[PDB]
Amino acid sequence: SPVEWTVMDVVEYFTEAGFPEQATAFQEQEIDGKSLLLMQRTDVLTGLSIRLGPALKIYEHHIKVLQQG
Amino acid sequence: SPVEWTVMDVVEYFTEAGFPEQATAFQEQEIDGKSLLLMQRTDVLTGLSIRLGPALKIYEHHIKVLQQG
Amino acid sequence: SPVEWTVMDVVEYFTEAGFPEQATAFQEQEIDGKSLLLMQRTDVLTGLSIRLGPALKIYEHHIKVLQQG
Amino acid sequence: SPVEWTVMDVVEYFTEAGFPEQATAFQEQEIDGKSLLLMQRTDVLTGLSIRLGPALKIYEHHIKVLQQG
Amino acid sequence: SPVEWTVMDVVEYFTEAGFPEQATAFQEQEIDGKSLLLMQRTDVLTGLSIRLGPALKIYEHHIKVLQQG
């Protein structure tokens, strides 16, 4: 079902996961669930224009978790 | 055949494929079919100045598909 | 343990370590101890906007050491 | 042999090779024949500030060919 | 002994090696001998804000040589 998430679904997920400031970057880059499942580490860390601290946790604890589950 | 595509052909491909806003980047970077078949992942995600969501699908389901065909 | 360090704990650590000018970058990027243990080499050298000389020592003699201890 | 080419020699080569617009970037970056033989793929695609399309051909059909000869 | 070099020692080295314009970047990035021995290729090519041609020689013929000697 993550593969079916809209951009707004992705924004809502990261808002509810505790990254409401960084969630808007997924809207800015038009990242839906299908694109989310295609992202690699450098895409999150350097491609979203977000601070490195949250970016590291967004990838390792959510994007990577989503791609593996 | 992609290898013979002009820059106009590459722009038309991504427009017809549903990326009309991103197709502009292929004109800006003067990417013909021969250059298209040389592109790697980071060239699409960071070399076109396009949004990451569309860039991820452009590489995975189009540039990669054309190169493997 | 480092995994529980706050952002201000991280800034304090690098201040005591002799990088007080670079310590502000960890505050800027909101890097706590959990984020610190997720960092890779390029994150320190290109993601903190600090000088390269201090960045190389910060990674080799502190971040690496903390991740390996 | 290319290893002896001056910066101007490199500029004239790419001018004669059909990349006159991109040839000035080798003057800007002060790339002589010895530097040319040290370049890797990302150096051409991101280090010359040239368009991606021409840069891909410049690496694949010229710089790589000179390094492998 | 290279590991004991100060920042200006490094600046002096690259000036005498024939890179006086690029030697200033080692002062700007506060790179002493200890930091010089930690540098990798991409640090020289993208982290010093120097022209690519000289940067390629600086890494291959000097920084790599010092690290291996």
DSSP, residue by residue, chain E? -GGG--HHHHHHHHHHTT-HHHHHHHHHTT--HHHHTT--HHHHHHSS---HHHHHHHIIIIIHHHHH-
Domain residue limits at B57: 1-69
Identify the three-state secondary structure at position B32.
Answer: coil
Q: What's this structure's resolution in Å?
A: 2.1
Nearest-angstrom CA–CA distance, D47 and D39: 10
Q: Determine how many CB atoms are found less than 10 A away from the CB of residue D64.
A: 15
Please name the amino acid found at residue A32.
D
Interchain proximity B7–D60, CB inside 8 Å: no
Q: Under 8 Å CB-to-CB from D1, ≥6 apart: which residues?
A: D33
Q: Under 8 Å CB-to-CB from B24, ≥6 apart: which residues?
A: B11
Q: Determine how many CB atoms are found less than 10 A away from the CB of residue A10.
A: 25
Q: Alpha carbon of D40 to those of C15, D58, E38, E53, E60: distances in Å?
A: 38, 12, 21, 12, 12
Nearest-angstrom CA–CA distance, A42 and D65: 30
CB burial of residue A62 (10 Å; 0-12, 13-18, 19+): middle
Q: Alpha carbon of E31 to those of B41, C43, E21, E43: distances in Å?
A: 33, 18, 16, 11
Nearest-angstrom CA–CA distance, B55 and A37: 13
Nearest-angstrom CA–CA distance, A51 and E18: 39
Give chain B's domain count.
Answer: 1
Nearest to E34 among C46, C51, C57 (CB): C57
Method: X-ray
Phi/psi at A19 (nearest 5 deg)? -125, 60
Minimum distance, in Å, between the CA of residue B21 and any CA atom of chain D = 18
Q: Determine how many CB atoms are found less than 10 A away from the CB of residue E2.
A: 16
**What residues in E contact C53, CB-CB < 8 Å?**
7, 26, 29-32, 35
Q: Alpha carbon of B53 to those of A46, A53, C47: distances in Å?
A: 14, 22, 22
Test mutation, D21, D22, D49, D56, chain B, max B CBs within 10 A: D56
